[PDB]
Design a protein around this ligand. Sequence first.
Ligand SMILES: CC(=O)N[C@@H]1[C@@H](O)[C@H](O[C@@H]2O[C@H](CO)[C@@H](O[C@@H]3O[C@H](CO)[C@@H](O[C@@H]4O[C@H](CO)[C@@H](O[C@@H]5O[C@H](CO)[C@@H](O[C@@H]6O[C@H](CO)[C@@H](O[C@@H]7O[C@H](CO)[C@@H](O[C@@H]8O[C@H](CO)[C@@H](O)[C@H](O)[C@H]8NC(C)=O)[C@H](O)[C@H]7NC(C)=O)[C@H](O)[C@H]6NC(C)=O)[C@H](O)[C@H]5NC(C)=O)[C@H](O)[C@H]4NC(C)=O)[C@H](O)[C@H]3NC(C)=O)[C@H](O)[C@H]2NC(C)=O)[C@@H](CO)O[C@H]1O
Ligand SMILES: CC(=O)N[C@@H]1[C@@H](O)[C@H](O[C@@H]2O[C@H](CO)[C@@H](O[C@@H]3O[C@H](CO)[C@@H](O[C@@H]4O[C@H](CO)[C@@H](O[C@@H]5O[C@H](CO)[C@@H](O[C@@H]6O[C@H](CO)[C@@H](O[C@@H]7O[C@H](CO)[C@@H](O[C@@H]8O[C@H](CO)[C@@H](O)[C@H](O)[C@H]8NC(C)=O)[C@H](O)[C@H]7NC(C)=O)[C@H](O)[C@H]6NC(C)=O)[C@H](O)[C@H]5NC(C)=O)[C@H](O)[C@H]4NC(C)=O)[C@H](O)[C@H]3NC(C)=O)[C@H](O)[C@H]2NC(C)=O)[C@@H](CO)O[C@H]1O
Ligand SMILES: *[C@@H]1O[C@H](CO)[C@@H](O[C@@H]2O[C@H](CO)[C@@H](O)[C@H](O)[C@H]2NC(C)=O)[C@H](O)[C@H]1NC(C)=O
Ligand SMILES: *[C@@H]1O[C@H](CO)[C@@H](O[C@@H]2O[C@H](CO)[C@@H](O)[C@H](O)[C@H]2NC(C)=O)[C@H](O)[C@H]1NC(C)=O
Ligand SMILES: *[C@@H]1O[C@H](CO)[C@@H](O[C@@H]2O[C@H](CO)[C@@H](O)[C@H](O)[C@H]2NC(C)=O)[C@H](O)[C@H]1NC(C)=O
Ligand SMILES: *[C@@H]1O[C@H](CO)[C@@H](O[C@@H]2O[C@H](CO)[C@@H](O)[C@H](O)[C@H]2NC(C)=O)[C@H](O)[C@H]1NC(C)=O
Ligand SMILES: *[C@@H]1O[C@H](CO)[C@@H](O)[C@H](O)[C@H]1NC(C)=O
Ligand SMILES: *[C@@H]1O[C@H](CO)[C@@H](O)[C@H](O)[C@H]1NC(C)=O
Lengths: 227, 227
Amino acid sequence: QQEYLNNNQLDCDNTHNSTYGNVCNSVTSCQSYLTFKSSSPEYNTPSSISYLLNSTPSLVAKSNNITDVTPIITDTMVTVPVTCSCSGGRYQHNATYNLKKTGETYFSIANNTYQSLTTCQALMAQNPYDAKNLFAGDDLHVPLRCACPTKKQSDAGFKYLLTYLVSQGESPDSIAEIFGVDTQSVLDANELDSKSVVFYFTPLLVPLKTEPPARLQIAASHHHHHH
Amino acid sequence: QQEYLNNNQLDCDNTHNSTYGNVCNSVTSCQSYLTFKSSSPEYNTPSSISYLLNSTPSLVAKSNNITDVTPIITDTMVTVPVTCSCSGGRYQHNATYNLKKTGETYFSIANNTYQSLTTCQALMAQNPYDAKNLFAGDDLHVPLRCACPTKKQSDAGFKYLLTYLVSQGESPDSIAEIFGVDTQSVLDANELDSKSVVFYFTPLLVPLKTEPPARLQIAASHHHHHH
Ligand SMILES: CC(=O)N[C@@H]1[C@@H](O)[C@H](O[C@@H]2O[C@H](CO)[C@@H](O[C@@H]3O[C@H](CO)[C@@H](O[C@@H]4O[C@H](CO)[C@@H](O[C@@H]5O[C@H](CO)[C@@H](O[C@@H]6O[C@H](CO)[C@@H](O[C@@H]7O[C@H](CO)[C@@H](O[C@@H]8O[C@H](CO)[C@@H](O)[C@H](O)[C@H]8NC(C)=O)[C@H](O)[C@H]7NC(C)=O)[C@H](O)[C@H]6NC(C)=O)[C@H](O)[C@H]5NC(C)=O)[C@H](O)[C@H]4NC(C)=O)[C@H](O)[C@H]3NC(C)=O)[C@H](O)[C@H]2NC(C)=O)[C@@H](CO)O[C@H]1O
Ligand SMILES: CC(=O)N[C@@H]1[C@@H](O)[C@H](O[C@@H]2O[C@H](CO)[C@@H](O[C@@H]3O[C@H](CO)[C@@H](O[C@@H]4O[C@H](CO)[C@@H](O[C@@H]5O[C@H](CO)[C@@H](O[C@@H]6O[C@H](CO)[C@@H](O[C@@H]7O[C@H](CO)[C@@H](O[C@@H]8O[C@H](CO)[C@@H](O)[C@H](O)[C@H]8NC(C)=O)[C@H](O)[C@H]7NC(C)=O)[C@H](O)[C@H]6NC(C)=O)[C@H](O)[C@H]5NC(C)=O)[C@H](O)[C@H]4NC(C)=O)[C@H](O)[C@H]3NC(C)=O)[C@H](O)[C@H]2NC(C)=O)[C@@H](CO)O[C@H]1O
Ligand SMILES: *[C@@H]1O[C@H](CO)[C@@H](O[C@@H]2O[C@H](CO)[C@@H](O)[C@H](O)[C@H]2NC(C)=O)[C@H](O)[C@H]1NC(C)=O
Ligand SMILES: *[C@@H]1O[C@H](CO)[C@@H](O[C@@H]2O[C@H](CO)[C@@H](O)[C@H](O)[C@H]2NC(C)=O)[C@H](O)[C@H]1NC(C)=O
Ligand SMILES: *[C@@H]1O[C@H](CO)[C@@H](O[C@@H]2O[C@H](CO)[C@@H](O)[C@H](O)[C@H]2NC(C)=O)[C@H](O)[C@H]1NC(C)=O
Ligand SMILES: *[C@@H]1O[C@H](CO)[C@@H](O[C@@H]2O[C@H](CO)[C@@H](O)[C@H](O)[C@H]2NC(C)=O)[C@H](O)[C@H]1NC(C)=O
Ligand SMILES: *[C@@H]1O[C@H](CO)[C@@H](O)[C@H](O)[C@H]1NC(C)=O
Ligand SMILES: *[C@@H]1O[C@H](CO)[C@@H](O)[C@H](O)[C@H]1NC(C)=O
């Protein structure tokens, strides 16, 4: 279990502990997964997505059952294998981001560019620039959100945790169905109860019993489960 | 100086020594440069070109005065900074290539995919697969052609050698003009005389006194030299 961000990352003056990253509460390093929606023209190939997220094109390609060079249709959510490890009491996966245009902000980088896989707070904590003093060409340390299964989750058969980017209309139930896991397991993973609200544009942990499906959209089909 | 390939790389039964790579005749490692023409949709960003050639997107971006994510217009020749080092008596820059489609061949990979930055012979020498037994998913060790300045070239003020992909219509004279070096220096670098023919689709070494220009096409303009 990790605390749910609960939209604290939208207010960059908020200092709730969850915004600084998942807590190191299990093994020091593990295999994990991120998710990311292809964005054209900058982040729509295994190469460019892997560059942004600090993965490899081969791992992206294998996780999605595509080649390492074919373009990914815009808005397709892909899986991105990453190593998650503990740093400073937090689980994270480090990446680097060079600002492209002056006018980018810690919030636009966390919420737009990285699609909520990091937070403005964790960017601010781990970088030297004041929020109002960012320029094109500045390099940022990007602490991407991931976690490793706790002992209790491992004992229940979860091999990995996946950082799932939630879209409007989804719910814990519908997300759990994509991955073939019980809803309660998604609730437990995020310290939520069955009436808790989950927001779109806020990442959610999904515990996995096996590697994720290669195509998430069709994995959401009712005909791809319960038969 | 290095021997000119002289189109030996078009006949993959040819075993001329030049086809196995530039010879290790100077320092064991150095900064060097490749060139590459953007190709859409697979190899038209700093990420995808760097993946193919084993560079970094940041080095590609800086060498070309572009950002690390903006698309490169198809057929634009870009500079690609690489480390060149000696292996097995040859200078080369190692990359890795996973075949995408069964039907790719050592020659199509060397001449088309890698735009003549390697040779079928060097691929064959450094990989285990018979020419007629290549499949999608096979990984190849790719020995990209580069060299380090000899002592004589360094003493003349050349800091780097660049592997230039020659296009139809060019000549030693016109290529030397792009880089602000004497024609004789390009001839010497490739063991050519002033009447030697240079072929398009065959890489040529260009000795450089400074980092290459950031935009090669306009560097070919008569108004960008001799005034
Ligand atoms: C997400 C996650 O991971 N969550 C976790 C949760 O899943 C987890 O929760 C746990 O989950 C588990 C998995 O689902 C779950 O496991 C299940 O548990 C079940 C409950 O234990 C279990 O079911 C068991 O299964 C066993 C084995 O098959 C069955 O056992 C059989 O029972 C039979 C009876 O029904 C027995 O038989 C009887 O035997 C007696 C003798 O032994 C016999 O008695 C004689 O009878 C004669 C007459 O018939 C008597 O003779 C008479 O005597 C009188 C008096 O003198 C005379 O007057 C008379 O004349 C004379 N008559 C004659 C003719 O001579 C004689 O005296 C008697 N003798 C004696 C000594 O008394 C009876 O006749 C027999 N009866 C019958 C009908 O045959 C049989 O022996 C026995 N077999 C064995 C091998 O032992 C049980 O029935 C069954 N129980 C039930 C309720 O179904 C499941 O198998 C489990 N599944 C699995 C996969 O393991 C966990 O329970 C669950 N836990 C909880 C807490 O929920 C939690 C926790 O781990 O963790 C989460 O994280
Ligand atoms: C790609 C690559 O890298 N490639 C490489 C190649 O580049 C490379 O090739 C090399 O490249 C180099 C760079 O280009 C190149 O360097 C150039 O080399 C040039 C040649 O050496 C050089 O030019 C030199 O420069 C020097 C210095 O400026 C000049 O020197 C001056 O010369 C003057 C004359 O012209 C001298 O003066 C005279 O002085 C005498 C006394 O010393 C004086 O004599 C008295 O005269 C009086 C009367 O006037 C006499 O008195 C009379 O006496 C009689 C008899 O008794 C009496 O009867 C009479 O009465 C009495 N009269 C009176 C009035 O009293 C008296 O007796 C005399 N005294 C004596 C003792 O005799 C004269 O009068 C003076 N004359 C004048 C006119 O003033 C002056 O002293 C001298 N100055 C100095 C400081 O020494 C030269 O002229 C000049 N030469 C030329 C030909 O131009 C360049 O400077 C170099 N450039 C650079 C950048 O360095 C290399 O040559 C080239 N190499 C090759 C091989 O090609 C290669 C190789 O490295 O490698 C490649 O890889
Ligand atoms: C991920 O980034 C963190 C920094 O946020 C790295 O931890 C630092 O590592 C350096 C060594 O390079 C130490 O000097 C610092 O003390 C570390 N800081 C903290 C807070 O632990 C961490 O090593 C990085 N991990 C990976 C796998 O790259
Ligand atoms: C955070 O990032 C998301 C995208 O991941 C932003 O959503 C976009 O907002 C614009 C409105 O300006 C819409 O045109 C886009 O279509 C939205 N994208 C999606 C995928 O719906 C969002 O505005 C950003 N900010 C906040 C506060 O959430
Ligand atoms: C480039 O590739 C060559 C192989 O073509 C590498 O040289 C080999 O390195 C391994 C160690 O990993 C040795 O066991 C082999 O004996 C080497 N072979 C030869 C022919 O020297 C070389 O190390 C690579 N260079 C870089 C910088 O990655
Ligand atoms: C080697 O690779 C080059 C491209 O780098 C090939 O040239 C192309 O050939 C086709 C003909 O089938 C033309 O339609 C293309 O426009 C050519 N490209 C360029 C840039 O001119 C060439 O065919 C390959 N083979 C040989 C033997 O050179
Ligand atoms: C995709 O999946 C199939 C198995 O269903 C496999 O045989 C094929 O090689 C895969 N392709 C890629 C590009 O991963
Ligand atoms: C491109 O070159 C100019 C110098 O002419 C420099 O100021 C600018 O930042 C450069 N842009 C990039 C993206 O490299």
